[PDB]
Every structure is written in structure tokens, then in C-alpha cells.
Design an enzyme around this catalytic site. Sequence first.
Site, short mmCIF file in Angstrom:
data_model
loop_
_atom_site.label_atom_id
_atom_site.label_comp_id
_atom_site.label_asym_id
_atom_site.label_seq_id
_atom_site.Cartn_x
_atom_site.Cartn_y
_atom_site.Cartn_z
N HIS A 237 0.82 -1.18 0.00
CA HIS A 237 0.00 0.00 0.00
C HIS A 237 0.87 1.25 0.00
CE1 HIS A 237 0.69 -0.91 4.30
NE2 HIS A 237 0.51 0.38 4.55
N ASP B 30 -5.42 -3.51 -3.36
CA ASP B 30 -5.59 -2.28 -2.60
C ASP B 30 -6.80 -2.26 -1.67
OD1 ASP B 30 -7.85 -1.56 -4.28
OD2 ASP B 30 -6.57 -0.39 -5.63
N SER C 204 3.90 0.99 8.79
CA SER C 204 3.75 0.12 7.62
C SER C 204 5.04 -0.22 6.89
CB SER C 204 2.78 0.75 6.61
OG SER C 204 1.47 0.87 7.13
N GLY C 205 5.17 -1.46 6.43
CA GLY C 205 6.36 -1.88 5.71
C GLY C 205 7.50 -2.24 6.63
#
Lengths: 56, 241
Positions: free
Chosen positions: B42, B91, B191-192
Site C-alpha cells: 500500500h 488495494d 507500515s512496511g
Amino acid sequence: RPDFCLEPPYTGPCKARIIRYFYNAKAGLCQTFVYGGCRAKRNNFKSAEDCMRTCG
Amino acid sequence: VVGGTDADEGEWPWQVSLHALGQGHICGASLISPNWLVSAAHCYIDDRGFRYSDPTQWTAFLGLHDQSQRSAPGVQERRLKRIISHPFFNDFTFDYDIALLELEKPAEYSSMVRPICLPDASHVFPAGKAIWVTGWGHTQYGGTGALILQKGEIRVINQTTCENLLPQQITPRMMCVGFLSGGVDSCQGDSGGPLSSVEADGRIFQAGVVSWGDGCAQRNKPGVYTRLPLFRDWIKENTGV
């Protein structure tokens, strides 16, 4: 006018930190908020310009 | 993250801070070699007129500790040659939320910048196993990020428990990590980032990528991340690592 313009700033389930602008209805001015990176809603733009040009 | 504390210089040499032109820090990533990272998906999805997928719009920070600290002895700075979001990422349902980021010029290993270890195809992280989350994400749902890479300890959870805590949402590529009573959990901006797991051999292995979750640190709402094993071969097949 867009009804989505009057809805509150939706962040989302994802966890990115993208500062985005949204129109503050009872404040006439667009402001900042954090978008999680997913499921964005119509009242979430990139610049103050974009925000104020469609929800003015 | 929420419920955690400040990490130390180099306590997580594989952590990375990713920034995008005109937006500062957005996501975190994981150094899996001299030329690659392992982040979310994302994080790099073209939206609102910005090419979040275009590598020319990103800068990565190796060995970063304090976000407000400019130019640091142990922090490397690098541009990205390319991003490879998984060919089956979604997504909306968040499936296959994983991507690979290639550095232009290599990273140069040092005390404060070392590559995390990738779990091999069949590795298993049994439920109940404590692991760690790191990042500069918001420090309490609905707040602001942190200047200093925070660290938090959570644990793996039974898959059905996961599936049922977040009805008709969990997919095999996902994994709930955290606590049922919350208090600690990853949040916006994390995130990530990589779930770091200390293994019986002494070395830490990436056991997941921060992805999403309903809220942050909520009871019965543990963080949802991307399992790292199922994509080992995909990594090998793409990065070459």
C-alpha cells in the site's frame, strides 16, 4: 457542495503516514489529517489547493 | 508503535525510514541485503495525483534513530532504482501486501546498518511466540509519529483466532501479531516495517511486514502483518537474494 466534503476525515485500516487535506465543513477551511494509505474517502486530497477547489 | 519504548543506537540495524518528496516519513522497510528492502505494498500505490510507485520520489534512511537529527555519522541515505509491488496485491482486501525496493547505490554494512535474516520457505513462528515491531509510526491511535525509532514486544497468535477477531478479512498471507488486550501494537507510519523475531540460534529473522489493522492497540484487534515465508522464493525470484 459535494456531500462527501461534509464527512469527517477517514484515516483507514492501513498504516502509512500520508498527510492529506480535507475540507472542514463547520470551519470553511480545509485542514490536515493522516491517511493510512488505503480505502481513502473522497474528502482527502494532496494539496490545500485541490481540497479547496472542490469543496470550497 | 503503541505501548513500546525507545530503541537504542543500532538495536535494529535492519529498520529503515522511507520518505516521499514533500511528505517526509511515510513508511518503514527492511534491509535484506546490500541492494534490497522489504516493505509494504500500500505504501507505493499511485493515489491523489502522486506517484507513490515512482522510485524517483523516494529516499531511504539506513541506520536512522532520530527523525529530527539531520546528517548523522551512522545514517546512510539512498535513492531507489525500482519498486516491485507484488503482482497479486489488492488495494482493498490487503492481500499480498508486500513489495521489494531496490537501492541505487548499495548500503555499506556497519555496526548500525546490518541486514535482517530472511525466514526460509518452511520456517514457522508458532503462536504465542514473542517478536518485535519497530518504527516511527504514531504513538497512540490518532496522534503523531515519533522522533525516535520506538520498539515494542508482541506475540504471534493462532490463525483462526485472527480470522475470527477480524471477520471475513484474514487471508493465508496474513498473520495477527500482538495481544488480545492490546496496549501494544503497530500504528500509522509503521507500515512496511519488519517484525523482528529472535530465533533460537541467536539471530533475528523477519517474520512479517506491518500492513494494517482496525485501529491501534485495541483489545481484540491485534496488528495484521504479511507472513514472510510464503514470499521467500518470490524474493529469490525477483531480487535474486
